[model samples]
Target chain A: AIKKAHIEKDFIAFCSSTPDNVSWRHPTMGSVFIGRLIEHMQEYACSCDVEEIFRKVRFSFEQPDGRAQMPTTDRVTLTRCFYLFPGH
Target chain B: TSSGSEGNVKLCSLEEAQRIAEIYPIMDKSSRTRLALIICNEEFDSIPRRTGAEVDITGMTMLLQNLGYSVDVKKNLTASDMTTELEAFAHRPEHKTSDSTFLVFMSHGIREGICGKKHSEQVPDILQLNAIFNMLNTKNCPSLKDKPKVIIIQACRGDSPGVVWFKD
Candidate 1:
């Protein structure tokens, strides 16, 4: 049997780039995996403010039942670092 | 067949739709390992040691670890020794189970091979970083055939940007 930790790690990495690289991992039962995002990525314009970049888009995170919530924001900059979930 | 009020009639078959339905297997992906082989040659017997090679090595090691790879870090290896190691690594069992594998070679270089301590001007037997990937091709390593094999050569090949950007 595979370790649950390893599955989570691979799942997260697979989220980075999907059909572009390899395939997606199947989540455990009751484990929710968002397959895709409703929002299409908006390209950066000539005049850009990186801060307000993704404000228009609404996004959320959910921790598996057993695990506690980990901070998703950048610690040093206190800014939200976008973690790419390919399908999502 | 259902005729649309303002469009062409359509014929739908449940048999056809079921024929192409994809069934993704629920294999234990966690059991699959992710490995990274790193070779960072900084010091040379003939030439001076690179300014901040230790830092780069540490950085690359950490980067691979962060990317979920169990890294195998190697130091200044001779041209012949590098070839031997590369050959051995190509046949590792881990490749079969890994979704992806990373081979990182960081050192001074020509378009061919990165220089080693005993690198000879006449012999040109330095580590052929790019040539090393030839061994990991689909024909040789069938385990990694469909998987992504990440090849990273952090060495100089061109005039300016090719220079090692890690140190400075």
Candidate 2:
């Protein structure tokens, strides 16, 4: 594992598709990437308290318009759903 | 950095979002809790389709399920569709839901209300916020009677510099 915690600047998460679009399903290739990203965070998570680890990590998808909107413009929160076991 | 729920909590990182959940560990390892994350990103050309809004009920249900609880998820629902879904989920027999529940929403919300996807086939209904909850009340949703159903909204309160100038 990399000794230093890395910020996810090199990453490019896609923004959400329109509502009513079944094609925007989860566990897709996108979910796999997000899962991997979260896993990395969990690994480093062991090295620090919840606060430091949490602050040190983040998930960002491409926002066509800078910031992600809510209610009207969006409905969900995560790009994927990841399950974590005791060691994972 | 504190509290269970707040408006527009900036999640600079996934860890930040998880950090914010430090006080609410009940979400994990609770077989008695049910949660739904409702997202409504309207435009397709503007935003992709895989962010938070479309990964609903099923996604959260998956997490809640892995945590040992029964969860139900539904995404890409219309305003009325959400009302309909909540109405059914709040009282669905197959779910046998728990009292400790959560409903989280993220979308292109407006002043006091959230909008549907731009790809919606019908005209907007000027949907009311409480109407949906009221429909899920014990009166309507017998299964969820005072069972502690929580609705978390991530939409905005205003669409533009716009406001209701007169009574409709």
Candidate 3:
């Protein structure tokens, strides 16, 4: 709420992705995770312009340029990028 | 795609930083993390005694803190000094931990390691900074292991910005 700039609040549920082949492929049930997580975060996220802190682009595998831009999708998202509070 | 979606997570330059902060407001002091920036642009150097980054590196770090994290930043260091500084940052107890330590190396990289300018004296090998931190790996940088060690190296990997091809 405080971060959301006085808007009504809701903190969507966030889950840990099973670390996989150190790639950027969608987690086993990623779409399902987003559907649920967004629903939860949608509450507070809408009011505040909270940005996405994906370790790597989550939609890349299915995204048009995923294969072209990222060095490898073979490793799990490095999670390192997430540390950049609110991301770049 | 002409859109920036492909490069969704970007390592921005000093000037582009403000727009970045505006888009992501989650970066505020409340996050309880410390942010540090080390920049070596051509403009910030001193002549025997002139120095500082663009008016923006200062504003950029400020924008970063405003978005939610505390930051410590510097500008216009030569290649050797940059290496020494990074070594210091890597070893500093304050920045050794996961959340406590975050680094951004923004400058023109030659071959691989960073440089102050086109002719700035180059540092040795790619493992340059690592040489210093190798001593502090997993155990020494214990708090850093499971945590993320993010490094952004924007290089002049090739001769020019456009694409080239070799005869098949």
Candidate 4:
């Protein structure tokens, strides 16, 4: 899609888990992916760009747990940085 | 670094900050229309319900809203309904004035695509992930051309557990 649409520099995507794995969810707290994502966004979104925010989310999943679920960021072709610039 | 204001400290270098300020057009809240579409499928005919998906919905909605987007959320859609919603959302006139848009989908899924409410081991009803990119691609949705499109998919890509072996 990036090649055909020529949006190589305009698209970004974040998936909760890798292609071979199943994403896990908490019965009360919700998806581990989303839970961590919301936490990072709330903390860094004010000063960080989207890519940085996603990077933080990915790092949060790197724990010592036996279940190996890894989130991924793909098709990121942004030529320039994107900032939410919240409250500005 | 001061603890209180550390969260607001810029993580990027000054050079990159300058470039962002000069190159990327700021999305002015009053003038620009930023929209987010969230489709969360929690219930299925044969599959077990997504017990915690409601929490995802609430968190995502609040996050986007706080970021100044007008969020459109849909729940429990079949494959056809999901397609219809994406098609309509891609062509919304709001895109013309928006600097960026967010598309989020949370549901049970397979390597192929998101599973619909009718999805089961037998029925196999799915909304192909590629269909979403097609619907919002530059050619199909010209209003969004040259604009940033952020996509978040919170679903299992497959049933297998992902792993890597360590040196023993």
Candidate 5:
């Protein structure tokens, strides 16, 4: 039981090391990372299984370029969506 | 030593580094209450698609779903329709039990509000921020009272800023 908490704290710590700086956003790396995490947790003596474990965390996105002028290379705050809702 | 010791004290030792992970709280997944309301306007009748909005929405949806949110993605809605949907969302029975609700608005936005894809007269009709927030506020949306309300707006508020090369 103690080991489980330690693992979770470590996992979050690793992910938080680089905030909003994920290599894979959609298809490849990000998705693969999630899949691997699910697999890793299955072998553990966890109170909750892989799918159940993900709920403990939350995520948000940010633009790489803040003010890039080009449509693809643009930088601005227009795309940045703030507190879009309430968290209970 | 307190300051430098803080850096030296690594909780995860060599043996601890490879420990198996677990669901921290180990609570029932079904018991968690998380909802995401995504209003993405990709195809507008009057305005062009907000570049990168689709990508942004997709990424956000995936993230939220992974975070235990039951995401509802509403695409290309009119101003009035958006209002109705938001109001309805506020009244959803799930909110009563949910821990938090996220509202994401992705579209062409002005300082006044986000565009609704149509122009009733000369103006581009929009879903005003005041209306949306008011509907979800404590007095109106009792189900979501005391809960965290996260609102994400991914839209263009104004035109680009560039050098005009002004001379004296």
Candidate 6:
């Protein structure tokens, strides 16, 4: 759909988990994926691009925990990088 | 050159960033508007309630607001209601003056779409994911043309656990 619309160059999507898996949610901490994402953004959005922020989020899931979830990016067609440049 | 702590972090001075912008073209943030929308479906008629989704909503709202976006939030919407809200957001005139937009949907989901409040395996009330992309495309929402559209979805894509394989 993104390609068909020809908006791929400006569109990006972050999915919590793959199509075959369930994303885990904690009773108090909220979702594992989203929580980590927020933490990474807070720490890095001031200096990094969106792609780098997401890469950190994906790396956090690499720990050898029993939870078997993996986040993924989909339909990314970014022509140039995106930065928050926060407080600028 | 930009510098920062270990790893891929690069902290650039505003002047350096502006110089790089000549090539990469960072969006016009001097006075341009930025918007974000969040839809979190926590309570559902036929499905289990998402207990911690409120935290997700709060966290995301704070993050976006801190990054200079005006945010609109909706909760516990049906599939139709989701579509209606998204359609209205895509058509907002604010996009004409906006540098970027963020759309976040946190809900129960299947492989095909986000599940509605009344969703069930038998009934399967869902908002197709592709519908969102189509609505926000240049043809439908020309005001947002050429601007970054960031989408974040936090939901279970299916019931199974992910797999890992080892070399024999």
Best of the candidates, lDDT: 4
Interface RMS deviation of candidate 4 = 4.0
The models' CA-based lDDT, in order, is 0.44, 0.38, 0.35, 0.82, 0.48, 0.81
lDDT of 4 by residue, B43-145 (tens): 8898888999999998899888777788999999999999999989987999888998899999998998889999988778898767888788887788887
Segments of candidate 2 deviating more than 4 angstroms: A1-88, B1-63, B66-68, B94-97, B118-126, B159-168
Number of the predicted model whose TM-score against the real structure is largest: 6
Cα displacement (Å) at residue B67, model 5: 1.0
Model 5 DockQ, alpha carbons vs. true complex? 0.05
DockQ of each: 0.02, 0.03, 0.04, 0.47, 0.05, 0.46
* Model 1 chain B: ten consecutive residues of lowest lDDT: B1-10
Per-residue lDDT over B3-105 for candidate 5, one digit per residue giving the tens place of the 0 to 100 score: 3312211122333323322212212345766677988786877665455555556565755664457899998898889998998898888887675566767
Cα lDDT, model 2, residue A24: 22
Candidate 6 clash pair list: none
TM-score of candidate 3 relative to the true fold = 0.44
DockQ of 2: 0.03
**Model 1: how far residue A8 lies from native, Å:** 30
Cα-based lDDT at residue A4, candidate 2: 35
- Location of the lowest summed lDDT over 10 successive residues in candidate 5 chain B: B1-10
Tell me the tens digit of each residue's lDDT in model 3 across B98-164. 2433344444333334445323334232323344334334544444444434333222332232222
Give the higher-TM-score candidate: 2 or 6: 6
Interface C-alpha root-mean-square deviation of candidate 1: 21.2
Q: Is the docking of candidate 3 incorrect, acceptable, medium or high quality?
A: incorrect
